[PDB]
Symmetry: D2
Subunit: 275 residues, 4 copies
């Protein structure tokens, strides 16, 4: 059956209702949804009181999962990450990032389930790498197309906040590596900016002051409201996004209330650039 | 009768339904609403198919109106400003500003009516001057409390875009003047940042490079998502805000579709700072 | 006879003694000097108690002169500009600029004569556009090579500081125009950065935030000490420079003492870029 | 006998001749010199073909010496540091720093001896913390007076450039610590800026974006030419400076030529602020 899809902007975002998440999706609906997650870069679904297991299953429909090397997992589902924030574990996601770009093959998508929410706050926003690229002048597209930038797990997971033995672990297992500044989408083939303030440390193909100037420019550029969507969470909301051409930011303005979110993280392939 | 008020965040924003705008508000509802516009800094109401006259009336319940010296007005209601954007008149409000801070006595509030909308886009966001102030470190509050900054109608209404005779008019009638960087709310008495990128040119109480550094800092600070609310417009939506402790930004991402918004602008008193 | 030429750095600057400025230079010495002004971008000569007339003559050996539309001239020599600074006329040259880049055909050189000096201070420095270009990464050279930037006499000669009738004059006679960001030297053929904070307002071939980011980068880059020379003035010192591949800055740290400098300004041809 | 002292600017720098460094200084000359190093913040002496031992002796006249935990020392004089730069050891001092501010009690002075020089280049400049402070607007002086900033040996001696065992050594022995942003001179009692890009990581008494904005401002401010002096080195030149109210920068523009400089480093007391 036809899914109802309501775009939330000209670029990024859409809201859908057609699924009973509780129930496996009919091949047919899965490819309406799959295609919606690509056309819009994020999609929101409401009233989906799923379990971790059921969430992991739906993620798998997209591809193999990735296990976070730091974050805690659900009960007996190590593929679904638990984000339980509160005073004893303050939220660290109020910063524009793309998930896990510190691995060779950063995730193609993730599925967020709103399990337990505070009165208000906790909004999460997404910014389009496609729309930001399209917003660059040609000479800037030509400048950035082909540069490579270093991503460092350590920039968003510093030593001092950690255990220190299990942190070192994840470090030696995740050294800084390079991804293209401008990423060509493996499916749509659309060009998109692919740096993120959370993990991108420097554009290695220019001088240091040069990199510094380009990144300050870029870490502000992706911040333009036109490039975004903002979601006001509600319990059992589901969020699904294309992590290869977006960044997102999760507001830290609800403490000391508690907030619980489950995430399924889907492995992607190796980001590249083509002309 | 009790108005239903739903907060959209811990700081700024709320949505209300209780009014039949078509109809004058009962003293009682007007002061629930009035108080809502103060507690939250912006409030949104839906399904309010009012006319310009009816909008002007509701504005008057708040205070005397101000007439814009540039923008066109409605039919036979010069107090309600018309914003009809499209290819022949591209939108100029995609920039964080506070309305009319280029006058001695910048408006205390405005009422926006969504008359004609495009498929999507056109979102308008608001940022809290109160929340941004509270987010500054003490030494920064002490640094900014007491400084004065110059506001220049010309910064957001440059000559080249204009008529040139009626532009000069509005210029000689609106010279650059000073307002406090930190404004004390005339009613709540709450402290709030009061510079805006649209009209603030320089903090006159420091050196030039100093002002420049503080403003770059401030024009980015107020941009923090936690300080904001974002509204996805729908026809006959009404927006009402406290223009003395907020800024707002209206997305330019709908051309060549047309978009029509009516505004009532309410005169405020003279901004001040107190400790 | 052979001129003694002492380089003051690997890039920019040199000091020479061989001339009796009082006396016209022998074709032969003029082309040692001419070539020195090109190899080094600035050259300094000491103990040259020349007159305005004698200075104008030497300038002419380089080419036609240009008359400044604002600055006062010498006695009966309108080609030599007088810079008499003091409390009643505070110095405005403490800012990195290239002289008269607000005309189509900005000067190829200038000759500065130190007529009357204060106890200390008043140092003037020069920065190499060649060395700064060579310091850019390749992708940056490729980005900047071919862009054009607007120069505006008004940016360094604002209305408020002025007469207002003779200022308007010079404005209508000198509208903003474009020069290449990277200039190819008409003689050496060397590539050099060619923006200057004094007159460059925006790089017109990119977006506004983009231009803004590149110029902030560039207005700081040319500031790197390696790219420069600093001259501690002495009475009857002569300074001669290649204004097409340098910028300079004159310290404002001698008031209320008086300081008098004479300048001859030599017209250049039209700046271009080639590969 | 009276030393000849020639100021090189209104603020910072002076050149002196009166000493036969080879020979111990007469109490009387030492206090002319001592006082010159304080009035001017740096002093330069030429034609002083001293040995390391003789240099260490002169340093001692100022106070106890400090031994660098990284840099190599002279023959049998561990108090005098050797800076032998060339292709196999490229220069790392082309960056504005104050020496050893990563210890509780950063040096009050240092004495630099130019042992072996390249054809040109290698200029070293000094910037006045006093003049930079005096250049801040009052509200900025009030903002910065009393803040504290963290200094980190690691910022200018990163792991990757190192041995790694002797580097760790110097790290565990030199953890990040705090100094006042505005330092009161222990003798003159003059107020001076006391952050340096080489070691200052963050102003701990404000927010992170705030610190970041103040430091970007400060790391550029101290760069104003008026605040400085630039020395063109000559063999057997001696440089002596007050490391508690200055920063300096040593040009990296002479490779592959070799350059040898000896330094004596004098321990200071604990920096403080007073009003
Ligand atoms: O907590 C949220 O709303 C999103 C957190 C986040 O960035 C993530 O799960 O990747
Ligand atoms: O058009 C909008 O959505 C708001 C425009 C604006 O800034 C205003 O009416 O003040
Ligand atoms: O006064 C000086 O030392 C130089 C002033 C200047 O910029 C000029 O004459 O072009
Ligand atoms: O090598 C120089 O000229 C100075 C190097 C430096 O910063 C130092 O010795 O402290
Ligand atoms: Fe995330
Ligand atoms: Fe507005
Ligand atoms: Fe000049
Ligand atoms: Fe040093």
């Amino acid at each position: 059956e036809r899914l109802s899809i309501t775009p939330l902007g000209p670029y990024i975002g859409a809201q859908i209702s057609g699924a009973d998440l509780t129930r496996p999706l009919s091949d047919n609906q899965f490819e309406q949804l799959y295609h919606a997650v690509l056309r819009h870069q994020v999609v929101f679904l409401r009233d989906q009181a799923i379990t971790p297991q059921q969430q992991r299953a739906l993620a798998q429909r997209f591809g193999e999962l990735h296990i976070h090397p730091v974050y805690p997992h659900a009960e007996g589902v190590d593929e679904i990450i638990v984000l339980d924030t509160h005073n004893d574990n303050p939220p660290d996601n109020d910063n524009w990032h793309t998930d896990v770009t510190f691995i060779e093959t950063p995730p193609a998508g993730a599925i967020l389930a709103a399990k337990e929410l505070p009165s208000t706050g906790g909004d999460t926003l997404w910014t389009s790498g496609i729309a930001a690229y399209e917003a660059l002048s040609v000479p800037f597209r030509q400048l950035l197309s082909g540069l490579r930038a270093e991503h460092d797990f350590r920039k968003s997971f510093p030593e001092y906040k950690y255990e220190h033995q299990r942190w070192r672990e994840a470090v030696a297992k995740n050294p800084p590596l390079l991804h293209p500044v401008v990423r060509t989408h493996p499916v749509s083939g659309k060009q998109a900016l692919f740096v993120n303030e959370g993990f991108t440390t420097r554009i290695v193909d220019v001088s240091e002051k040069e990199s510094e100037a380009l990144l300050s420019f870029l870490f502000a550029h992706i911040t333009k409201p036109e490039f975004q969507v903002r979601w006001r969470w509600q319990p059992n909301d589901i969020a699904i996004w294309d992590n290869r051409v977006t960044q997102h930011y999760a507001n830290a303005d609800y403490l000391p209330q508690r907030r619980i979110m489950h995430r399924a993280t889907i492995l992607g392939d190796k980001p590249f650039y083509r002309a």
